[PDB]
Design a protein around this ligand. Structure first.
Ligand code: HEC
Ligand code: HEC
Ligand code: HEC
Ligand code: HEC
Ligand code: HEC
Ligand code: HEC
Ligand code: FES
Ligand code: FES
Lengths: 235, 423, 181, 423, 235, 181
């Protein structure tokens, strides 16, 4: 049905293979236009998410663009301590660091990446340079598709992003059918990581605190029932 | 009567050399063994909740300020530094952000408990005045604070809630510029807000000092229209340990729910658009400032000369009182009248548990509050305009006319004696 | 004397207190670095006349939009009657009626007005940025903060916003430039 | 005796409805008409000076924080933004920076006034304890504050006065890292210090609250070894208006001199090297932290195993108590012993105006303080080492041994009766 | 004698012709190596110092180096609102924004610029790439000039700055002998301006406050003498 | 029971309080962004052997200075006696005696030690930066914060500083490079 993720609930600590797949997808597809400045590269070793091997992290970092410096202007080797690059303009898009919170979030990305079908039977010609999406709601609409008072008759609208993937864009090393849907789910989970890395710690803290406070509250209820006994016994 | 029982410092030599600094005398005689009635329901806890929440917010803020950098270019980045690198991070931020929500929720129940059981009625005016002063301070605080992340909603909320001060004539733009540090919003506003936001809580604590001093000198309301009968008072058990433990039990429950929220539903009360950096060149849809200011936002954006009950066309008699100024006055009055209440209710009576008509009007008032909360988020298109106008009109009507009429013709009830209600 | 001396001491204390307080209220005013508030040269430079052009200045956007005939005719067909603000807020001229002939803009150093219109993209209600690109119920601009409908020439309509979109002082630089300030 | 004269709230209806919140009762009965002796010299003013200076610092700081940006890359720039663009700028900064100097100068005279006229002697121990606590808080505050400009002296002063905590064994490096936010100094330290620096003054005010509560419950010391003779007390005129006006006159003079300094000699008490940005790679000559910490800096850097009176070679018996730790303990003890004084002076007597030997030793102590101040700035090369060792030894000797011996054999003086000294 | 400046005292509001002369020298001599980032270009119109004509300020600004931007990387027109440029390295020196306070200050600059005489008769060969200065004290010294315990026998030391001026380096438009000494004094005053622009306001505030507080203090003394009269009359 | 129940409630309250307090004391510890604390490759690259070389790392300077014969002979002529710290703080080897043969540095991937010496430019007293370029009363480094005289090889002398200048873990990169970390 709704294709719920793993983390959608009181449990679900970010199944990591899914995140490694999303990383294969993000660095080879989405990175061409998008960036994640709010994301340090070293986080690809921190627990909770992709617990990759540090050495591979340093390699992948040195293999990225050149972030010059802060003290002496000079194109450095881009050490992991720096942040992911930033694609800013000239046919590029926003930053995906926290896009999983600026919208139930990841379901938006899934049902957005999912859905770029051809132009409907109201404006088949479409638009030059703009492509159609069935779920983006903040895009333009031709006058042919609007109602009598400016509202659109289409489910979604026209987004400036092209279709990101075809039937079998990339291979998975673990062994898995790399259709469009699985890639969309995986990349959605990866972005949710990039936004909420400390999710599992959140849940564990919540459990511990609920327990301890229920205990404290029960003990206080007993103490209250006791103290207030000689005044609530005859009635 | 009013047994203070100073303890006479007879314990031992330690309690006798403490005759240099009285302090323990104060605590014991007054702030712990304060005779409180037996008839207290579960609505007299929220003050402890508010005190604890205030301490919590102050602490978490003092911690955050060790990592927040007030500047347009480094605020968002510092917030992410917090939520990612720092050890506890997300906890402090979510506890700070949501705890504000609980704070205001708790003051709402604290205030409406008061309106029911005549806690504003004499001889408890000073407490009411101080409480309204506080409410103002804490609203201003939360406002200054929502700005610091320099997200997208921050910018525009600040923009509008500062254009208010500029609406008024003659001294509007001057005040606007003197408050923003310039013509529009920029880092200067951010520095002001951070400082101010990091200073008012202490003023609030002091005001809470006077708040607590007042209702210790003046007896706690009690469910009925009766006092502790000072003249020895078999009623009026002490505060410690009974009511302390009761309040702590309720507080444990409340914190349990609060942490469950923090850990499972933390981004629920927030606005996602506050997670995208600011663009002074693009405004998002449905700014929707927050949820503890929607009532007054609606009272403001209701009067627009778009109804047959539009008093703006009549106030235009004077060419200076335009619409904007009218809405601003309406909001300031929505609060000033709540403050003036104790001198409007012309009743020699007390808690509405013995005033039926008052019960009905009061529940209508609670409903009006909820409705205003729900309306400030919805557009100004029909029919919501009529709804907002009706609700604001009823608020003002209640607080101005309804209470006098009741105080006149509202005594078909047998008042209870003997605050010792052994039923 | 008792009265004179006591009251004079009090007066002097008050005066000194006020002289000390005033700067604590003066520092919050615009500082010299904000005093600058100067001009900007935006180059129209063939941006495909008819859609829009926005530039930052003074901390607020300055809208430079070409004209689309349908937008124009809708403009020129607006009698002063039923027009909320008929003052033509544009500060490059006197309080002449808010007419499209005066309200569009100078004429490139030539003679024509129904082709360009640069106004301050700041809603007069409380300072929000209206959405452009043909929006609202009048084929102009729409403010999403409270719902104020602007018209083609920028005059306010259908909302709380009292006045239209002002027009700063601007002249042309011989057919490819704009001077803002 | 101890006439409080509560005023009985007999003024009028206003002073009768104020029976809800007592406040004016407190002020009048206690904090204004507090009987103070007639025998007060000009040394009992500096408390008013300290209160006013504290208010001044708090205000000026709240103003600066509206323009200071805590970050290594934008602190210096913000300070210059202040001194150039802001309207008042230089005034606030110079008044903030120098007023710290006056604050400490005034506490020095406040403290040494006390040591003379037996103000630490019973029954005035609590005041002394609270005062030492304050002194500590305000030292830490000024230290946190000298760092914020991120000049050159800031960095290195912080470096050393944090390496202190690391000297101790086992838990030194851990505390060092937990305090600096890391192995060495960087923006994290700056944020901590700014927050902390913007918070302690309020704790100081509260502690000043208790400071004022104590010596109102306990009578002000007086030049004589006598009390106000409570049993009606023709002596002991009230505070208002007499002593209020006297203190305000002295305060006007002091502020006059202070502003003359601010306007003609403002950069005199400062270190020029704090006007060059920081270089973690280059250290200047003669860091010379400040002038209100030189005594303890010298007591620290004196013990180095470089004299025949070097007790470090003897303390090396235990392999853990090295030199550094020894100096740190020596400084902490230099303060702890001053705090312990009231339980070391074994005299059933009072103000040294009737104890000659005490006069001589006390003036030697003042000279020792001045000498230590002058020595912390000069290198550790001969002969200054012997001087510093002698001075520290005398400080400790005074406070440990000298007072007992006096209390034993120090009563060749006729004590004065009748605190009404109409001479 | 000591060649005291104008501002050296309770008065002396920065004789402005001196500062215009110092500016003519700074932009034509010292600017080649030094900078003043902590100094906006719009201060050359603010009162107190050189009250130049704004238009000349905009011209001189546009005639300087290119300070690119903060939002969109693109070499702009170096608008006055920006700050003076910065010369950082490769044969360059520190920033002179506040050098008049990081040292009686301006006298250091005067007696430093003044004094580059030939190498003394202890090390006439000198050093390659370093030049000798009478007053700089933080420079190296050859071993031939040090005493038995490392202390130098020379008045000053060797500074990395070359002699900045000759006998008649530049012309003054007002008409004045442009010898080295006058230029040194003028540039010292200019730097003191760049460091303390709000000096005159300082002095005027000090005067006003001294006066008002003396008045208040006198009145309080009278009030005290009065109140305490019936208790200090018989003795 | 009275005693058991009351004391247990108190104990639970205390435990919860402590569990809530600990993080308020944990957040001030080094954060993950400070956890990194990794390496740096400094290239000697002919900097005219004999004067000095300083580089920033970990927030502290790392001194890489070539050797001057007079400096060397003064070093090699120091018997362990009269040497405050004889531990050879260098962490690239065991606690072997603070001898110049062990204390100078690895040998370029070759066989020689009396030519390079890279130590941590941080005074062990309280962390100041000593001045180099032949200074002090021993022809080495001088700390201006309190007056600590270092020797040629960096061993502490004539001052409060208890130990010599440590030597981080470093190896060579085949005759033109240094690896710090
Ligand atoms: C350029 C060829 C792109 C690549 C490849 C990808 N994206 Fe993108 N994206 C691009 C643009 C120009 C825009 C703006 C669209 C607009 O109309 O404004 C976007 C937008 C997105 C968004 C935001 C949608 C929204 O509601 O605002 C998302 C969530 C997004 N894109 C996701 C995404 C992913 C996961 C990609 C890799 C699989 C990816 N995009 C590639 C440009 C380009
Ligand atoms: C390069 C050709 C220079 C020009 C022209 C000027 N200065 Fe300079 N200066 C330069 C260097 C490389 C240094 C550093 C010297 C060192 O040994 O470190 C300096 C230094 C100064 C100083 C600081 C002196 C000190 O005590 O640290 C001052 C006050 C100074 N220079 C002044 C100055 C003036 C007024 C100039 C124009 C007349 C000027 N310098 C030109 C490089 C160069
Ligand atoms: C010691 C400092 C401090 C105190 C005291 C404090 N806060 Fe804050 N507050 C901050 C900081 C820092 C931020 C920005 C970081 C953040 O948003 O969590 C902030 C942000 C906020 C926010 C926005 C939260 C977000 O994430 O957008 C709100 C709402 C708020 N404060 C309300 C309050 C209220 C109400 C009080 C007390 C009455 C209070 N704060 C006390 C420091 C403090
Ligand atoms: C605008 C009104 C208002 C506000 C806001 C308010 N109070 Fe009260 N408070 C009252 C009134 C009325 C009473 C009843 C006093 C009585 O019964 O004598 C009261 C009572 C109390 C009590 C004792 C009885 C009780 O209800 O728990 C406490 C404790 C208390 N308040 C704390 C607080 C704190 C802490 C805050 C804010 C941080 C606060 N209050 C805000 C008006 C207010
Ligand atoms: C509300 C904030 C605030 C308060 C309260 C405050 N200060 Fe500061 N202080 C600052 C700021 C901001 C700076 C950095 C700007 C500056 O140096 O003037 C600073 C800097 C300092 C400096 C260094 C001055 C300089 O220019 O280098 C000292 C010393 C100092 N504070 C001491 C104190 C002491 C002592 C107190 C009270 C006991 C105090 N401050 C109260 C905000 C404050
Ligand atoms: C370490 C000691 C110490 C410190 C520091 C200190 N005090 Fe006091 N203070 C005393 C003592 C002792 C007395 C004498 C009390 C008495 O005579 O009963 C006193 C008395 C006073 C008095 C009343 C008589 C007088 O001397 O003026 C005031 C007012 C006062 N202090 C204010 C302050 C303030 C404000 C501060 C700091 C901001 C401060 N003090 C710091 C110890 C201290
Ligand atoms: S702000 Fe533009 S309409 Fe309300
Ligand atoms: S810090 Fe290096 S010797 Fe004191």
């Amino acid at each position: 049905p709704d294709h719920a993720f793993s983390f959608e609930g009181i449990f679900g600590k970010y199944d990591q293979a899914q995140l490694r797949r999303g990383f294969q997808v993000y660095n080879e597809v989405c990175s061409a236009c998008h960036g994640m400045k709010f994301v340090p590269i070293r986080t690809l070793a921190d627990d909770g998410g992709p617990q990759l091997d540090p050495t591979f992290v340093r390699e992948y970092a040195a293999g990225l663009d050149t972030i010059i410096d802060k003290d002496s202007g000079e194109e450095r080797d881009r050490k992991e301590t720096d942040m992911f690059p930033t694609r800013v303009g000239d046919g590029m898009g926003p930053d995906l660091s926290v896009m999983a919170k600026a919208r139930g979030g990841p379901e938006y990305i899934y049902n957005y990446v999912i859905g770029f079908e051809e132009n409907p039977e109201c404006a088949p010609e479409g638009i030059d340079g703009y492509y159609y999406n069935k779920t983006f709601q903040i895009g333009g609409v031709p006058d042919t598709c609007k109602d009598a008072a400016g509202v659109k008759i289409t489910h979604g609208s026209w987004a400036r992003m092209p279709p990101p993937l075809v039937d079998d864009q990339v291979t998975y090393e673990d062994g898995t059918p790399a259709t469009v849907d699985q890639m969309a789910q995986d990349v959605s989970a990866f972005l949710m990581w990039a936004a909420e890395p400390k999710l599992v710690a959140r849940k564990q803290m919540g459990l511990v605190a609920m327990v301890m406070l229920g205990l404290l509250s029960v003990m206080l209820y007993l103490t209250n029932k006791r103290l207030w006994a000689p005044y609530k016994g005859h009635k | 009567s009013g047994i203070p029982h100073d303890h006479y410092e007879p314990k031992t030599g330690i309690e006798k050399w403490l005759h240099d600094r009285l302090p323990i005398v104060g605590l014991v005689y007054d702030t712990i063994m304060i005779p409180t009635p037996k008839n207290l329901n579960w609505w007299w806890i929220w003050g402890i909740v508010l005190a604890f929440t205030l301490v919590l917010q102050i602490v978490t803020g003092i911690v955050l300020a060790m990592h927040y950098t007030p500047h347009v270019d480094l605020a968002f980045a510092s917030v992410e530094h917090i939520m990612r690198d720092v050890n506890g991070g997300w906890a402090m931020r979510y506890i700070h952000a949501n705890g504000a929500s609980l704070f205001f929720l708790a003051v709402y129940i604290h205030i409406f408990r008061g309106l029911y059981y005549g806690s504003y009625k004499a001889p408890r005016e000073i407490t009411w005045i101080v409480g309204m002063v506080i409410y103002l301070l804490m609203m201003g605080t939360a406002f200054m604070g929502y700005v610091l992340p320099w997200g997208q909603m921050s910018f525009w909320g600040a923009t509008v809630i500062t254009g208010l001060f500029g609406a008024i004539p003659g001294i509007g733009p001057s005040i606007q510029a003197w408050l923003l540090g310039g013509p529009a919003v920029d880092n200067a506003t951010l520095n002001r807000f951070f400082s101010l936001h990091y200073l008012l809580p202490f003023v609030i604590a002091a005001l809470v000092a006077i708040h607590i001093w007042a209702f210790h000198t003046t007896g706690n309301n009690n469910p009925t229209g009766v006092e502790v009968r000072r003249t020895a008072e078999k009623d009026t058990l002490p505060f410690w340990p009974y009511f302390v433990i009761k309040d702590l039990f309720a507080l444990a429950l409340v914190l349990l729910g609060f942490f469950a929220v923090v850990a499972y539903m933390p981004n629920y009360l927030g606005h996602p658009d506050n997670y995208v950096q600011a663009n002074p060149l693009s405004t998002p849809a449905h700014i929707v400032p927050e949820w503890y200011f929607l009532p007054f936002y609606a009272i403001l954006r209701a009067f627009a000369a778009d109804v047959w009950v539009v008093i703006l066309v009549d106030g235009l008699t004077f060419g200076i009182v335009d619409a904007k100024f009218f809405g601003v006055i309406a909001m300031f009055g929505a609060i000033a009248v709540m403050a003036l209440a104790p001198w409007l209710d012309t009743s020699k009576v007390r808690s509405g548990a013995y005033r039926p008509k008052f019960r009905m009007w009061f529940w209508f008032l609670v409903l009006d509050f909820v409705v205003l909360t729900w309306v400030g988020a919805m557009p100004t298109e029909y029919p919501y305009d009529w709804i907002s106008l009706i609700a604001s009109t009823y608020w003002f009507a209640y607080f101005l006319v309804i209470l006098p009429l009741l105080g006149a013709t509202e005594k078909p009830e047998p008042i209870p004696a003997s605050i010792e209600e052994d039923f | 004397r008792r009265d004179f001396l006591y009251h004079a001491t009090a007066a002097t204390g008050v005066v000194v207190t006020g002289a000390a307080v005033w700067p604590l209220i003066n520092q919050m005013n615009a500082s010299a670095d904000v005093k600058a508030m100067a001009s900007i040269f935006v180059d129209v430079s063939a941006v495909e006349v008819g859609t829009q052009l926005t530039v930052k200045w003074r901390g607020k956007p300055v809208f430079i939009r070409r004209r689309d005939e349908k937008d124009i005719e809708l403009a020129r067909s607006v009698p002063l009657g039923a027009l909320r603000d008929t003052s033509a807020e544009n500060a490059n001229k006197p309080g002449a009626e808010a007419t499209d002939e005066n309200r569009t803009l100078p004429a490139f150093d030539g003679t024509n007005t129904g082709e360009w219109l640069v106004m301050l993209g700041v809603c007069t209600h409380l300072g929000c940025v209206p959405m452009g690109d043909k929006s609202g119920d009048f084929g102009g601009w729409f403010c999403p903060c409270h719902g104020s409908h602007y018209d083609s020439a920028g005059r306010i309509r259908k909302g709380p916003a009292p006045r239209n979109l002002d027009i700063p002082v601007a002249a042309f630089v011989d057919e490819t430039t704009i001077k803002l300030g």
